[PDB]
Amino acid sequence: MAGLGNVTGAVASGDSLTLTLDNGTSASDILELDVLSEELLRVDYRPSGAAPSPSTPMIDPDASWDAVGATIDTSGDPIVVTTPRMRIEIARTPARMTIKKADGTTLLWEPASGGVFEDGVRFQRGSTDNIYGIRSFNAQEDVGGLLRNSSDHPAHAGQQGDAGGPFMWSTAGYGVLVDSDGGYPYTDTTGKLEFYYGGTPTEGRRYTKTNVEYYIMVGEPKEIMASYAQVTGTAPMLPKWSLGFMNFEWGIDQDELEAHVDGYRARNIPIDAFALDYDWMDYGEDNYGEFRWNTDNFPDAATTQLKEDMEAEGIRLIGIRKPRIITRDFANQRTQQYYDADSNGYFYPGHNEYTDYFIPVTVRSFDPYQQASRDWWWQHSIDAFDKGIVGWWNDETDKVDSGSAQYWFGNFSTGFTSQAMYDGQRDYTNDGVRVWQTARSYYPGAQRYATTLWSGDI
Amino acid sequence: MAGLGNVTGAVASGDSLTLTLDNGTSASDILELDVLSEELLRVDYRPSGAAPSPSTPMIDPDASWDAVGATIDTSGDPIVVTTPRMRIEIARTPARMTIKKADGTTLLWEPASGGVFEDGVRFQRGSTDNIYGIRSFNAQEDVGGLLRNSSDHPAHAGQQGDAGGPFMWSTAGYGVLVDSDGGYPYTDTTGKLEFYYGGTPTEGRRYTKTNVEYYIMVGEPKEIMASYAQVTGTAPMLPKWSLGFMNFEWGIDQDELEAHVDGYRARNIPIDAFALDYDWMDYGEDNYGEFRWNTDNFPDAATTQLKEDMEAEGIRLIGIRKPRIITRDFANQRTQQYYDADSNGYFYPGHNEYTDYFIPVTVRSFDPYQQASRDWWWQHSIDAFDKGIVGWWNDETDKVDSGSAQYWFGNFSTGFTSQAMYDGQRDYTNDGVRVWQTARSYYPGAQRYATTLWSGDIGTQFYKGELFNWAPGMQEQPRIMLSSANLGQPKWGMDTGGFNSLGGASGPNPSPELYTRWMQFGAFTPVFRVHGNYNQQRQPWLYGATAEEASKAVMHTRYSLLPYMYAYEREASETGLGLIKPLLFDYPNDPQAADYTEAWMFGDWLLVSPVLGEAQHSKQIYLPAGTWIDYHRGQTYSGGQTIHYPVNADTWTDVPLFVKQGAIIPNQQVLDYVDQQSVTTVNVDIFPSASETSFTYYEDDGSSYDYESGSSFEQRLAAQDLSSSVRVEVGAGSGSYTPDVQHYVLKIHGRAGSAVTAGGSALTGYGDLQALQAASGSGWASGRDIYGDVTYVKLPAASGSATVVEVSGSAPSAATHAIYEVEDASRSGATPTTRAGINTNHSGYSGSGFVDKLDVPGAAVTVYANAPVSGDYPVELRYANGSGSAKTLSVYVNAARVQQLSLADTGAWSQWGTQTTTLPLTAGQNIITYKYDSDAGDTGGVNLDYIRVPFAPTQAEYAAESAKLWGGAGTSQDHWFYKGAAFVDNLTGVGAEASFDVYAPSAGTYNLSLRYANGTGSTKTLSAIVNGGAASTVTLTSPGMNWNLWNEHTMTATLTAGRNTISFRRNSGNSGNVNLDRLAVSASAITTLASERNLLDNGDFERDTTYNSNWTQWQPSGQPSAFGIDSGNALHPPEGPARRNQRAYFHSDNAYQQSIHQVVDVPVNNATYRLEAKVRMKNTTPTTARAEVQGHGGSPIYANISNDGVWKTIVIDNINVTSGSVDVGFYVDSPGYTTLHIDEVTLTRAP
Ligand SMILES: OC[C@H]1O[C@H](OC[C@H]2O[C@H](OC[C@H]3O[C@H](OC[C@H]4O[C@H](OC[C@H]5O[C@@H](O)[C@H](O)[C@@H](O)[C@@H]5O)[C@H](O)[C@@H](O)[C@@H]4O)[C@H](O)[C@@H](O)[C@@H]3O)[C@H](O)[C@@H](O)[C@@H]2O)[C@H](O)[C@@H](O)[C@@H]1O
């Protein structure tokens, strides 16, 4: 957790400056500065001069910049790097960076206490500076503001609409971007602006870095953002239809889709796309069913016909994808896609197969406390009894746990459910067929209605 | 919490002892002891001697004991009950029970501090006694032992194998059983043995007891247990086969069952039964599927064959039962079982519909991090792509939660999943088809692979905690969007309408209000999309006519802006900056922009601030440095301030949108979809600033990556306001793509030139925009629009050289009206091939044509017309009618049917006429529709040429509820007969005020009329302050002690040109205590406003249902009301209102009669009135269903309502009122299930 030592060597060449820093050993630390643009500096700290690790997929591998022709003056203390847009000062003893505008305004700096080190970057800046980036908010979180002035939330992709990254910037005229697979940005109102690799995040870490590769941006917000896009990549242009209105829908087939499109077109309500949920594909089936059009829902997707008729009406189709495959189909048989993925090693590391559900059913609890309800429940069971159900396995007379639904049945629910079958069967068979039942709860009195108890999902 | 008082009486009789206990009062406590057996005592404590409540189902209702012949000695202290097995002592002062064995050993006793009491029993016993009972353990719990020596666990049935009850006993020789529905047993190692009813337990309580009924057992454990069974019941004998082995199984059919049984039998492994899980029944299906044998799994269960064949092999069958029914079948239809349960009330109380799953599959996550894995993933996607999947909605690349499965995907999973599709599609199509994707996470770098971000499973609610706390709602979304933009992912969207509700998929859709506001918001975000949960619908027409029309209108604005928006899509490919940004991007040094999210930039030149509040009448909007022009209303605002912005809560037509001075905004005709046709004229709206600004117009093929190697087109447009001219440069064309655009029409706002020059040549002047558009070759024209003076300049696009245009001079138009050629407007109809049409097959039309095909029911044309202020606008319709007689069309304004127009024959189809109708327009955008509404009795059958809308109304109105309220002034709906969505009240404290922003075309004296209520009984006062001038007194008389009466206060005011402030305030000397509704303003004498014609209170049922109205209801004595008011958003699909948010309904599952009625005193007696309403009926044909008018001085007038399922208009005209009042009503006589919806009821004075 210590800062860099003294500078023992400074080699300038073009837009690059390489500093050798004393660390007490024969393997000195290396710090490589590269002026990428007039307002963008790449810093690569290599502890004990070890080779850098590969950059994570944050970094655009095709990124390149024109020569800047920065001035690099190693003649004194501090060493000075200048462009028309920024002035970088590296003090020699110990090595500490200060970043300034070309006009001399101090933006951020590595404090005496310590700056870059083997596990992150540490800067100090104006305590009233407004900080942005780092994180957003997901569909299960309290939603804060834009400001990140007292932030310790990790840098992650997150889930459920979240966004994040090791990118922290200010309207005071600077940004910091660290190449990293997750990690821990930190800010506070004393002026700290830091980033730590830390321990393995919740989401895992598959790209480890021995070096610390980071970028310093100078400029107004749009300039910072443009520099961010130079480092991590610009966005390819989407199809122009993607500026139009889109109707996403779960629970839809071809006839419904046609009626919806007709409803929009009849009303001159513009629309360019429908997105189809599970409905579009044979999810759950063998032979890559989770990639295949569901022709029960969409008969004309047996060929290019659906595509072409929808295109003729100005509708493009989007389809939902899940990054998983069905490994046992509806009939519990191993699928072709399982064998192919298993033999080639295509499953996500640490993720084992799991039983899952995707076909929702709507239900609602009956009330066994009412005689008329019990009479009804029994009446509708007679046919099943006649055709061989002679024992009643009464499950879930205790509590529902389904999504937002946490509903308790009352203490007499087992007794009364049991009573419905007991009274009914005894009446129907004129006391000629003994009743047998089981339930997974018991309260005094339930035993009058011929029920056993089983110990649940052990 | 105190113990019993002194025994004051003791009556022994047989095996019973009845004690009377002192409690201070004349109604003494009763304690009944009954010796049931030699070792079983019943105790019944009845506070104040009240009758006991019924015993819970714990108690065997048939329990019965032989006489014991116990000895009861009341002669001393203690009283003594003995049997051969126990000795019960009751001390007299205070009453305390001690229980002993016959031999005198003390088992337990009530301590001095208190025993039995109103909410339980309290005993003391040996501290080393071992206690048993109370509770067991479930399949999700740590499992303890048998001892209950330090227990505070509740007595409950519990879940998942639990057992429990108010039964505590000891091997030291005693037991205690309390009759109770749940409760709280307590033991500790000091010797306490207690039971409390307590509050309602987690599981609920449906059996409440005012008495305390309990039982004391004496004996060894088997004797205690036998006594327990005497009280609560013995167990009937199970079938003998139930002592055998049973194989329970889930995932089984008849073939497998037979194989299993053969397996047992072949090996002589005994077995008596198989239990069948979901497999046995048609769970999920209609017609009681959850009670019916599944004959796909078990074919021989079609008859008794399966039962009989299995019985022959010695196998009995057990079937799983769930205490619930399926309420929706696999095609989302209500089930028979639902209808039966719902109508009879058989659902568990407090348990609503919810989502279950019963069909499992097994899945496993793929690794997108590997190139070989990505190749495989793409290869298997090709067939779906060929057959129409051209966009990839990549879900759950973040985290999965499935049981024990809590698996995280790594930070690069969205990027790499996107790369699989991106690299793949680009290779397969040879860079010929652009990639589109969306994911629900973002991490830096993912943007390289062409993916947007959506905000995940957000809640269908206005804000987090409105309806539920576990997901954010609409109001949080701008903060999520702008946080994403701050991370370099500006390509963002949300589930407009929301995804999650209480109850899951079966839970409610958004209200029409929530839906409409969300659509207006979404139209100004990058990825514009609706979504909802399983089997939910998000089509705009389902949410009523306001949602439909407001959504359509804002969608037209977005699509008109395609050329503007598309330049930002290109910009994102060069710098990553996109279509939206927070204000802080442009204003890094502004502290009021630092955390600002209620407004944002849409491109460089538009600031948008959608109305996101429920029932919001006004908005505070921060405008940063510059000059801003209201897009819809035309007025200018100086920057660097928070403005008060009135909005119309009644129409929902406002989307607050501000043009940044400097703006250069390319726009086009509205297409149904992006490449519906070539667009050859692009409009460029220019609002020049004193500094030069520019916008680079951009085209390419919209479809491929050809743009990457130069195949695109751009032209830099630049503008500057100079000392006495405006200069606009259209730079030379650039790039190799040949664009569709042939001409720009520059619309240069703020100057109506006398000359327009270019290259030492003065351009040819034309009479107006239409003449200019029809001319070949360049030219100019001038006019007036909502913003003021405008100069039009038509020039060729894509020239090889730059053109500099200069507009000089000032010659303002004399025009009094804007003209909208209806052939340029929005044409609709019942189906895609029956929309209103365009034609030129009769002569004499203005513009390029006229609108025909208004002769198929439902055909319509809709004009979007801006108004600077709310008020009366006489709108002229030009039409032809060569039919030989009058024809009718409906005119709708902001989704309200304003009038049926009677359009006279004009002599021939090539001869044209005009009809002028005063329309109630609101400030900003208005939706004006001419429609053949056959369900309102229109004929249709005319051709329409244009409408002319005056730039100024005849008189203006300003809603008090939308004014700037201060000093405690607030909005309310808690009195009747207000106009608009509300009124203003609480003008009580000194300083309370409502301040109106009133606009005037010129300096002068204007008439004001202030609508107010004063039900104090006496005259009250406020002060009027105009432009901060000297206060004048406003004296406001009272009609009497009645806050449902409104009056006009008329006055004059000197106003200046432009914006004026007119405040009504309780100054120090004023009394206040009046309610304010609306301020009318006119240069002429003020008359009845077009928006205020309706004489009914709450005729549209839009009032918050917490507050009542002048509507009354009736049903037969003893029948529940079948009437309510709501939005219809809880239904799937929604059955929405005719307009705005709410509609009345009549519905019952049983036979019913129901009416609503409203009586009003009319303004002018001995005159003619007219009743109009929207009505919709479905389900069973009722015997009677009608609108009714009565009490008017004539006999009742009826109009029948006809069972369709569609909204129709019912009209009762020519109501001759001579009584001074009218009763309007709606009545249904149904055999059951008939649903009537009623909305938009109006009673108006009829010409
Ligand atoms: O309205 C539909 C849903 O929408 C949102 O979720 C979107 C989500 O939908 C799909 O996944 C649904 C859920 O699937 C799994 O959990 C399902 C249940 O698993 C267990 O129970 C299984 C069965 O066990 C038997 O023994 C029992 O007899 C039977 O009744 C029971 O169903 C759990 O014990 C239950 O509690 C679960 O309900 C996942 O584990 C869940 O995370 C998931 O919500 C779809 O496949 C997904 O891709 C998609 O993301 C709402 O959030 C959701 O509540 C709602 O149902």
Ligand SMILES: OC[C@H]1O[C@H](OC[C@H]2O[C@H](OC[C@H]3O[C@H](O)[C@H](O)[C@@H](O)[C@@H]3O)[C@H](O)[C@@H](O)[C@@H]2O)[C@H](O)[C@@H](O)[C@@H]1O
């Ligand atoms: O309804 C108003 C309408 O009246 C005239 O047009 C009538 C009619 O003219 C066209 O149809 C003519 C004719 O076509 C076929 O022969 C059918 O079999 C006939 O029933 C039909 O009458 C036109 O196609 C129709 O749209 C139209 O209703 C005026 O000429 C119209 O301008 C005016 O809108």
Ligand SMILES: OC[C@H]1O[C@H](O[C@H]2[C@H](O)[C@@H](O)[C@@H](O)O[C@@H]2CO)[C@H](O)[C@@H](O)[C@@H]1O
């Ligand atoms: O329970 C009040 C409810 O009644 C109506 O909804 C009916 C619907 O009209 C019927 O067609 C059928 O689907 O059953 C529903 C009863 O739940 C009203 O339309 C609705 O507003 C109201 O809430």
Ligand SMILES: OC[C@H]1O[C@@H](O)[C@H](O)[C@@H](O)[C@@H]1O
């Ligand atoms: O019906 C499927 C499963 O449902 C659970 O609630 C029961 O406890 C199990 O015994 C049963 O196999």
Ligand SMILES: OC[C@H]1O[C@@H](O)[C@H](O)[C@@H](O)[C@@H]1O
């Ligand atoms: O596939 C069903 C649902 O799954 C959820 O994980 C997604 O976030 C929803 O958008 C989708 O509708």
Ligand SMILES: OC[C@H]1O[C@H](O)[C@H](O)[C@@H](O)[C@@H]1O
């Ligand atoms: O002004 C509103 C009031 O009007 C009538 O007096 C009603 O009886 C009352 O319930 C209501 O609150």
Ligand SMILES: [Ca+2]
């Ligand atoms: Ca015309």
Ligand SMILES: [Ca+2]
């Ligand atoms: Ca009002």
Ligand SMILES: [Ca+2]
């Ligand atoms: Ca309404």
Ligand SMILES: [Mg+2]
């Ligand atoms: Mg370089």
Ligand SMILES: [Mg+2]
């Ligand atoms: Mg390290």
Ligand SMILES: [Mg+2]
């Ligand atoms: Mg601060």
Ligand SMILES: [Mg+2]
């Ligand atoms: Mg659907």
Ligand SMILES: [Mg+2]
């Ligand atoms: Mg079709």
Ligand SMILES: [Mg+2]
């Ligand atoms: Mg198939």
Ligand SMILES: [Mg+2]
């Ligand atoms: Mg293997």
Ligand SMILES: [Mg+2]
């Ligand atoms: Mg007796």
